[PDB]
Design a protein around this nucleic acid. Structure first.
Ligand SMILES: [Mg+2]
Ligand SMILES: [Mg+2]
Ligand SMILES: [Mg+2]
Ligand SMILES: [Mn+2]
Length: 325
DNA sequence: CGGCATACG
DNA sequence: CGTAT
DNA sequence: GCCG
């Protein structure tokens, strides 16, 4: 089992679901406390389990797995022995975890904001509603739409939004294309948002494109909230006899950078962090969603596909559905 | 012990 | 500070 | 929290 998540296939569904879910609770809790290093290790350990070809049934099977030391091993041992890990349950129950989770779920609210509210004694969404002078306009949007935004988006919904985005993109810049990215591209059947990457086969034609797109969507009455290269929107999505609010991200990249932006926006988030860490630490190359830089020759790699990028970095190619780290 | 991904709004 | 993978 |  290789040490970096980008060195191994990680399928969407796997054989250690409960074990990985428990470690991810501890990862999430570490994040709420600002402990990025611990969050990372628990994320990585959970990910290793996702990559295994069968269930872990005995403690000895963790021997030699990367990212399993005393703490993560003890968590797994308790689950294997008792079906429950006391630490994990204590986290789930805690007022601090439940409130930070509730608050950070709000669009416009991050760990730092949630934590300050927690410290001020706020606990519920209605606490926030009953003091709206303290909220940014983004936070007000996130709070108004919070219920709809907590409902899973389905693949059927995604096909509907794509047609709608293509229509606007087509008027804004004929020839421009729209590609579905994020979790849906990795094969997820549900999600909490939809991500699209927009480009044009003629380098440079995509300059200034996003505002033209947004103006047209807004003119069609489809935008409940927004507001460059990235747009984080709330869209109005038709439902039988009604509609619901859905988070949609729109991103534009020039065609030269498209493989890099596709790779970055397809995720998973942990996969991309690991891929960038691998690039920098193992290959001495600097990767981002725009390109891949050799800081010794001071040159950028041209890529025509994601395949090219995996080859540049000396990694076996993984399709999106195996990037579910 | 240092490091932990790397952007844009 | 927020957002994204 | 763990790796190198
Ligand atoms: Mg939030
Ligand atoms: Mg997404
Ligand atoms: Mg997501
Ligand atoms: Mn998104």
């Amino acid at each position: 089992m290789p040490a970096y998540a980008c060195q191994r296939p990680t399928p969407l569904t796997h054989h250690n679901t409960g074990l990985s879910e428990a470690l991810e609770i501890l990862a999430e809790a570490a994040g709420f406390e600002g402990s990025e290093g611990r969050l990372l290790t628990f994320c990585r350990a959970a990910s290793v389990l996702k990559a295994l070809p069968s269930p872990v049934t005995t403690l000895s099977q963790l021997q030699g797995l990367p990212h399993f030391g005393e703490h993560s091993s003890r968590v797994v041992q308790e689950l294997l022995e008792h079906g429950v890990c006391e630490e994990v349950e204590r986290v789930r129950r805690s007022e601090r975890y439940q409130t930070m989770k509730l608050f950070t779920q709000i669009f416009g609210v991050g760990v730092k904001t949630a934590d300050r509210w927690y410290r001020e004694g706020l606990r519920t969404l209605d606490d926030l509603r009953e003091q709206p002078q303290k909220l940014t306009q983004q936070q007000k949007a996130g709070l108004q739409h919070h219920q709809d935004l907590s409902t899973p988006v389905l693949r059927s919904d995604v096909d509907a939004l794509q047609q709608v985005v293509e229509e606007a993109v087509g008027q804004a810049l004929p020839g421009a294309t729209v590609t579905l990215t994020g979790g849906f591209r990795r094969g997820k059947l549900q999600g909490h948002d939809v991500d699209f990457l927009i480009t044009h086969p003629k380098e440079g034609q995509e300059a200034g494109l996003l505002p033209r797109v947004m103006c047209r969507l807004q003119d069609q009455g489809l935008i409940l909230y927004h507001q460059f290269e990235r747009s984080f929107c709330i869209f109005r999505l038709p439902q039988p006899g009604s509609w619901k609010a859905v988070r949609v991200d729109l991103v534009v990249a020039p065609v030269s950078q498209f493989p890099f932006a596709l790779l970055g926006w397809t995720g998973s988030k942990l996969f991309q962090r690991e891929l960038r860490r691998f690039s920098r630490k193992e290959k001495g190359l600097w990767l981002n969603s725009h390109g891949l830089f050799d800081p010794e020759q001071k040159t950028f790699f041209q890529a025509a596909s994601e395949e090219d990028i995996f080859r540049h970095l000396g990694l076996e190619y993984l399709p999106p559905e195996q990037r579910n780290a």
